[PDB]
C-alpha cells in the first residue's frame, strides 16, 4: 500500500475521496496550507542557474513550472 | 524576450525568491495567494488512480 501526497483546492477534495474508493484507498492525514503563487519572467539563458539556486535555497522543495 | 514560469512558495521564502530573481535579471509579473488542502493518501500500486485523477482535474493534479 504505497503512500503519496496530494495538493488540491478544497472544492476538489470530496471528489478525490470518491476516486480513492474505487482503488480501495484511504486518507491517511490531512492539512491546510496557504502559499504565495508567483508568475515570474526571466531570460531563457538564466533558467537553469535560477532553478538550481532555487533548489539549494529551498532544500529541494521549490519547483519552477513552465507555462504552456 | 523573457520566458514566464509559475512558482509556489510559503510566505517566508518569497523575499529570498525575489532576491535570487534579481540576481538573474528576473521580474515578477504577478503574485497571488491561495489556500490548499494537503492530502496524504494510501493506495496499492490501482495506482488507474492517476489516470482518473487526470481526467478529473484536466491535467492539473499531481500525485507525489
Amino acid at each position: 500500500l504505497t503512500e503519496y501526497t496530494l495538493q488540491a483546492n478544497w472544492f476538489d477534495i470530496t471528489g478525490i475521496l470518491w476516486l480513492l474508493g474505487q482503488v480501495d484507498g484511504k486518507i491517511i492525514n490531512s492539512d491546510v496550507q496557504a502559499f504565495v503563487l508567483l508568475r515570474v519572467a526571466l531570460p531563457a539563458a538564466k533558467v537553469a542557474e535560477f532553478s538550481a539556486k532555487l533548489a539549494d535555497f529551498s532544500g529541494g522543495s521549490l519547483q519552477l513550472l513552465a507555462i504552456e | 524576450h523573457l520566458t514566464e514560469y509559475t512558482l509556489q512558495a510559503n510566505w517566508f521564502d518569497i523575499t529570498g525568491i525575489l532576491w535570487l530573481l534579481g540576481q538573474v535579471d528576473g521580474k515578477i509579473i504577478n503574485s497571488d495567494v491561495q489556500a490548499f488542502v494537503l492530502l496524504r493518501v494510501a493506495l496499492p500500486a490501482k495506482v488507474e488512480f492517476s489516470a482518473k485523477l487526470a481526467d478529473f482535474s484536466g491535467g492539473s493534479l499531481q500525485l507525489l
Partner: antibody
Amino acid sequence: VQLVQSGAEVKRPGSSVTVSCKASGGSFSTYALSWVRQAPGRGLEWMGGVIPLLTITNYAPRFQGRITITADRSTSTAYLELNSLRPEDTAVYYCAREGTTLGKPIGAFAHWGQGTLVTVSS
Amino acid sequence: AEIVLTQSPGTQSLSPGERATLSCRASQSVGNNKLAWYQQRPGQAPRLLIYGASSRPSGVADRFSGSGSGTDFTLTISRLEPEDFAVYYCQQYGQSLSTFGQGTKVEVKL
C-alpha cells in the same frame, strides 16, 4: 537597519488602535516585516507580516478579521491595525524585520522595534 | 497546521560558566529546517541567536550553537555569562503560519 515604533496607547474595549513601525537603513520594499506581540508575563506570538513590494500580507488565523497590516513604501513605515480591542489584547507589540547575510534574506527576525504597549481597559 | 513548539525545561537554574542545553520539540516536521532561537532579557526586545536551526548571525558569540532537524532542536550555551540569564524562544517559519514556543527561562542557580 533600525525600527522605531509609535508611543504607548491606552484604549477602551471595542475600539481600534494603530501602531506604526518606521524603518531606516537598508531597503524597505523587498524584505519581510512582521508583527509579534507579548502579553504581560507571557510568550512571543507571531501575528502576521507584509512583504511591501507585492502588498502581500500573511495573517495568523488567530488574528484574521480583527487585524490589518499595511506598509507604505513612500515613508518606509509599516502599520498594525487592531480592531474590536478586548482586555486580552493588552500587550507589547513588536515589529520585526528579517535579517540578511541588500543581502540575502534569512526569514528569522534579526531586527526588532523597541515595542509599543497597548493597554485595553474599561 | 498550527505547529506546536514545546520547549523544555520550562524554567531552570544554572551558574555562570556552566553549559545550558535547551530543547524545542515540534508537533510536526519543520520545513527546510526553518527554526530560529531568540534571547530576551527583562525589559528588552528579543535578539536573534540562531536561524536555519544551526546558523549564527554575525555579532552573536560562538558560545551559542544550534542543532537538530525534523522535530527535535537544541540550543546550547557552552558556558553561561551573566548576560545570558534570560528567556529563550524557539520559532518555526517553514510554513506561512509561523509559531513560537512558550519560552525557556534560565535563572541564576541560587
